[PDB]
Structure 1
Amino acid sequence: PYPWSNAQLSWQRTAFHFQPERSWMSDPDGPIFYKGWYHFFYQYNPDNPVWGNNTWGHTVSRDLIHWLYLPLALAADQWYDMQGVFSGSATCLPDGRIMMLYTGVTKEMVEMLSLAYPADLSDPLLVEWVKYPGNPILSAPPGVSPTEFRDASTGWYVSNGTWRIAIGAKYNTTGIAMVYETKDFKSFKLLEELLHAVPDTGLWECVDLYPVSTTGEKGLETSVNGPKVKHVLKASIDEQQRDYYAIGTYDLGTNKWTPDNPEEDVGIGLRYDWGKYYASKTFYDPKKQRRVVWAWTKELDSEVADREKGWANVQTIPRTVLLDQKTGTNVLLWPVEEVESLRLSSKEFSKVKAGAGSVVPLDVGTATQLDIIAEFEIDKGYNCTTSGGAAERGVLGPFGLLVSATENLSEQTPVYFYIAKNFKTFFCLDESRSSKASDVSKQVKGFTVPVLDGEKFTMRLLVDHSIVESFAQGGRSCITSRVYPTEAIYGAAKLFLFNNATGASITASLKIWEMNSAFIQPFH
């Protein structure tokens, strides 16, 4: 174990990502927009920076960036939720009501669905929450374990007052999504037809089903269906602690979701993010007509270090979700536009040359709170995970940026493109030399990314102390990770352009913004 100093640990706290004042935070819960405020709830341990004693924290903002702490929303305080309050989804009804479904756990570890709602709908801040006196409302059916019956989705409307929700589970090694019908969100009936199932995935947690447009650049309200509408089906794959999605079609008549590509079905195809990114939940934003995705990123250091610093885990910056209309076969994820309100000043680097085996310093001053947009051109089998990262030199890769780096590269975090031979483009993030400390993650993360005719290779990086978020080709591929440098901290952190290819030189242009604090604080 590394002997972390107070100064090394203090630096790890983020400037502009959501995290509570102290302690453990994890899964997103019941995100909504209501009466001028974006609302976010989250799993929270009041006692220690480890998983447990599960309650719901609550925060609000005008803009998805400038968060304000509110009082705890739900506590573990009844027999049916004494071992924790978990994974909630809100359904907002036409009459103005907000119905919050959650999973409560008993002393025996038995999981059951329960209902909560606001004490006062006239309160824009929704400070106080009440539990339905008829709780608990739903226990596991005969085919599903009562200790693994969790995570109701946001509802979608059918007809004649009937709504549907999804609950993920498994049968043996096959992941499944069950559907229940309700008219009041107090009593539920299980449908005979599953929404969908995929063999050899294991348990599906946190199932999400939502419409996306094939024509516009707006998100769609959750109950929208029709001819120019496709549906994303998403599941958190428990055995992998990773989130997978697929694009398909949902039929209200049959209650079946069918994949456009069975080879890329839920759990065996595309991910929202190829890094550390879990329990994602979307909601519809009526203010700017967007669909927004929340997800948490666990610490990648030791539990010993977490207990010493007194906190664990952060949320990514929320992202929009749209269908990629250029390909038709993936989604695009991109940080919400309000993140740009943090941009202080910019510096531009135009047509910088990097020959084979070169490293080029980029003088930006402090390099710990940044938004970076870069484009690369090559002047006139492989797998990120099993590769040697930036050290594995090929004819047409690797090339990209070094973030969280020292002057002499004693520590560095490469984010790069690698073109392999029909050519494939890989986009990867290399943790192998991110820190001199031995008890942190040292993996290479990534995947292929589609690069279309005439397109430059493009990446955007958000750098914020111990979290880095990366985006290729406008969000066709994303990679999120955590870094814990021992030396590349405060003024000692630097930024570089690099090209470790053997048979290509590159030309790059960059624009880099220093980023302000989000000033996350208590509501007054």
Structure 2
Amino acid sequence: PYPWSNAQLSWQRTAFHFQPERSWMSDPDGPIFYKGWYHFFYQYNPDNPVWGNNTWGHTVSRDLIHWLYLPLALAADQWYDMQGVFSGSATCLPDGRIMMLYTGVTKEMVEMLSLAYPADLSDPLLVEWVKYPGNPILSAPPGVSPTEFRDASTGWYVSNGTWRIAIGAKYNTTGIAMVYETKDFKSFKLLEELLHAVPDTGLWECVDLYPVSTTGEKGLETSVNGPKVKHVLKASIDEQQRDYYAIGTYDLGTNKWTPDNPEEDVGIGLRYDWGKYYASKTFYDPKKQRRVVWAWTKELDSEVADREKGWANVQTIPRTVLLDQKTGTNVLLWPVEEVESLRLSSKEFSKVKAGAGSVVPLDVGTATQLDIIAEFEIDKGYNCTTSGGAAERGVLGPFGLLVSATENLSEQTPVYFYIAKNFKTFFCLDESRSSKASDVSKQVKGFTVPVLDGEKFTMRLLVDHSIVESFAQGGRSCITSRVYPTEAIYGAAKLFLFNNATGASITASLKIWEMNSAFIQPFH
């Protein structure tokens, strides 16, 4: 139990990621774009920096970045949601109406579906929310447990005024996704056929079904379907606290989603992010024609420090979701372009040489608020999780960057590539020496990343105090993590380029931006 100072704890607050003024925040809830405003709702405990006397926090921004706090959107104030207003999604109807589906928990721990909608659709800010007088509207079916019946998705249109929503659950140890049909979002009929099911995954939380284009570079509206449209099916795997997705096709007639690769099905294949990243929700952004993904990153320190500091958990910068059209077998995740508006000044390091077993210092000034773009070339079974991280020297790795580092490397957070003997490229983040405090996460996170012919090794790092976001090969693989240095804070936080391979020297080019605050504040 490390004795944290006031200065160490205050440093942990992020400059440009979304978080409330104080207390606990988790799952993203019904994000929409409405009348010039980006709306974001979130799980919020008003009382303490722990999960959770669940209510829905509400915030708005013009550009998915400069957020403004609003009054609380939904409270635990009715018998059917007294134990919490759990997660949920918004469906926009063609007549301008917004239907917000959320899970309500009774004091008996029973979870039921309920409807909320704007009190006043003429208000762009959508401050006041009303609960549908006929709540609750849906309880668990026979197969599914009534204490584990949660997380309705955004609806997609079928015909004759019929919409479908997806609710994930389980049969025994089989993760499943049920589909309900509705015409008014007040009554639901359970379909006989499941959307999909995968053995040995456990409970599926926050399921998400959405179209991706196979030719365009735009996002698609959720109801879009056709011959050149693929569907991503995504579930949060509760037993793991990790998000998984797969690429396949969805048929409106059969109501079936089928994976393009069954060995990489939902829960047993790819992740959006290989670090701390959970309960991700997407929405369609009609202004820039994008699909944007939201997700929260839990604290990786002790609960004692959370209580001492007064708050817990951040949202990652929202990312775009596109199909990787170069591989055809993964998605590209990339921070929204508006994050670039935070860039202040840049410093370039052109063709820097790093020999085997070397550490090259990168003078950038302050290194706690950064956007780093780096390309790497090599001149002239492994597994990140079970590896020794940056200390495990191989012939062609590890090499890359050290962020959140002290002058003498007493604390360090490597983000690195490791090439292993066919050639597998690994992209990992090493938490093992991030902090001198023993009561934090000391894990090595990561996975393989595809590198195609001609491509350099590229990583983008978003550094923002106690959160690091990393992106390999344009976002084919991402790693989000939390760091809690005891010494590498304020002026003492430094940045290095390293190469710990035994038989390879690397050459790198970096552009490093200093990042401004997002100035997150209460709405005027």
Q: TM-score range by the shorter chain?
A: over 0.9
Matches of 1:38 and 1:426 in 2, distance apart? Answer: 36
Match of 2:229 in 1: 229
1:324 deviation in Å? 0.3
Q: How big is each residue's C-alpha offset from its partner over 1:323-374, in whole Å with a ceiling of 9 and x where there is no partner?
A: 0000000000000000000000000000000000000000000000000000
1:197 deviation in Å? 0.1
What is the SS of the residue equivalent to 1:390?
Answer: helix
Matches of 1:470 and 1:131 in 2, distance apart? Answer: 40
Matches of 2:145 and 2:461 in 1, distance apart? Answer: 42
What is the SS of the residue equivalent to 2:247?
Answer: strand
Matches of 1:511 and 1:39 in 2, distance apart? Answer: 32
1:416 deviation in Å? 0.2
1:88 deviation in Å? 1.2
Match of 1:307 in 2: 307
Q: How big is each residue's C-alpha offset from its partner over 1:35-58, in whole Å with a ceiling of 9 and x where there is no partner?
A: 000000000000000001100000
Matches of 2:131 and 2:493 in 1, distance apart? Answer: 49
Match of 1:7 in 2: 7
Matches of 1:104 and 1:193 in 2, distance apart? Answer: 26
Matches of 2:116 and 2:283 in 1, distance apart? Answer: 18
1:93 deviation in Å? 0.3
Match of 2:423 in 1: 423
1:452 deviation in Å? 0.0
Matches of 1:306 and 1:107 in 2, distance apart? Answer: 26
Structure 1 length normalisation: TM-score?
1.00
Q: How big is each residue's C-alpha offset from its partner over 1:112-168, in whole Å with a ceiling of 9 and x where there is no partner?
A: 000000000000000000000000000000110000000000000000010000000
Matches of 2:441 and 2:251 in 1, distance apart? Answer: 43
Q: How big is each residue's C-alpha offset from its partner over 1:401-423, in whole Å with a ceiling of 9 and x where there is no partner?
A: 00000000000000000000001
Q: How big is each residue's C-alpha offset from its partner over 1:257-289, in whole Å with a ceiling of 9 and x where there is no partner?
A: 000000000000000000000000000000000
Matches of 1:299 and 1:341 in 2, distance apart? Answer: 27
Q: How big is each residue's C-alpha offset from its partner over 1:156-195, in whole Å with a ceiling of 9 and x where there is no partner?
A: 0000010000000000000000000000000000000000
1:105 deviation in Å? 0.3
Match of 1:249 in 2: 249
What is the SS of the residue equivalent to 1:94?
Answer: coil
What is the SS of the residue equivalent to 1:230?
Answer: strand
Match of 1:84 in 2: 84
Matches of 2:24 and 2:107 in 1, distance apart? Answer: 21
What is the SS of the residue equivalent to 2:159?
Answer: coil
Matches of 2:400 and 2:344 in 1, distance apart? Answer: 24
Matches of 2:87 and 2:209 in 1, distance apart? Answer: 16
1:196 deviation in Å? 0.1
1:317 deviation in Å? 0.1
1:214 deviation in Å? 0.1
Matches of 2:477 and 2:196 in 1, distance apart? Answer: 25
Matches of 1:78 and 1:348 in 2, distance apart? Answer: 57
- Give identity over the alignment, percent: 100
Q: How big is each residue's C-alpha offset from its partner over 1:16-43, in whole Å with a ceiling of 9 and x where there is no partner?
A: 0000000000000000000000000000
Matches of 2:392 and 2:143 in 1, distance apart? Answer: 49
Q: How big is each residue's C-alpha offset from its partner over 1:65-111, in whole Å with a ceiling of 9 and x where there is no partner?
A: 00000000000000000000011100000000000000000010000
Q: How big is each residue's C-alpha offset from its partner over 1:449-497, in whole Å with a ceiling of 9 and x where there is no partner?
A: 0000000000000000000000000000000000000000000000000
1:295 deviation in Å? 0.1
Match of 1:522 in 2: 522
What is the SS of the residue equivalent to 2:307?
Answer: helix
Matches of 2:340 and 2:243 in 1, distance apart? Answer: 26
What is the SS of the residue equivalent to 2:124?
Answer: coil
Q: How big is each residue's C-alpha offset from its partner over 1:412-459, in whole Å with a ceiling of 9 and x where there is no partner?
A: 000000000001000000000000000000000000000000000000
1:513 deviation in Å? 0.2
Match of 1:295 in 2: 295
Q: How big is each residue's C-alpha offset from its partner over 1:226-271, in whole Å with a ceiling of 9 and x where there is no partner?
A: 0110000000000000000000000000000000000000000000
What is the SS of the residue equivalent to 1:397?
Answer: strand
Q: How big is each residue's C-alpha offset from its partner over 1:281-326, in whole Å with a ceiling of 9 and x where there is no partner?
A: 0000000000000000000000000000000000000000000000
Structure 2 length normalisation: TM-score?
1.00
1:396 deviation in Å? 0.2
Matches of 1:476 and 1:143 in 2, distance apart? Answer: 37
Matches of 1:203 and 1:291 in 2, distance apart? Answer: 25
What is the SS of the residue equivalent to 2:177?
Answer: strand
Match of 1:138 in 2: 138
Match of 2:411 in 1: 411
Structure 2 portions without partners, runs of 5+:
none
Matches of 2:488 and 2:152 in 1, distance apart? Answer: 43
Matches of 1:518 and 1:39 in 2, distance apart? Answer: 16
Matches of 2:416 and 2:36 in 1, distance apart? Answer: 40
Matches of 2:91 and 2:340 in 1, distance apart? Answer: 30
Matches of 2:388 and 2:52 in 1, distance apart? Answer: 37
Matches of 2:190 and 2:166 in 1, distance apart? Answer: 10
What is the SS of the residue equivalent to 1:338?
Answer: helix
What is the SS of the residue equivalent to 2:48?
Answer: coil
What is the SS of the residue equivalent to 1:386?
Answer: coil
What is the SS of the residue equivalent to 1:398?
Answer: strand
What is the SS of the residue equivalent to 1:384?
Answer: coil
Match of 1:503 in 2: 503
What is the SS of the residue equivalent to 1:158?
Answer: strand
What is the SS of the residue equivalent to 2:397?
Answer: coil
Matches of 2:248 and 2:80 in 1, distance apart? Answer: 37
Give the total of aligned pairs: 524
- Report runs of 4+ in structure 1 exceeding 3 Å deviation: none
What is the SS of the residue equivalent to 2:7?
Answer: helix
Matches of 2:78 and 2:357 in 1, distance apart? Answer: 63
Matches of 2:146 and 2:395 in 1, distance apart? Answer: 54
Matches of 1:150 and 1:308 in 2, distance apart? Answer: 32
1:201 deviation in Å? 0.2
What is the SS of the residue equivalent to 1:340?
Answer: helix
Structure 1 portions without partners, runs of 5+:
none
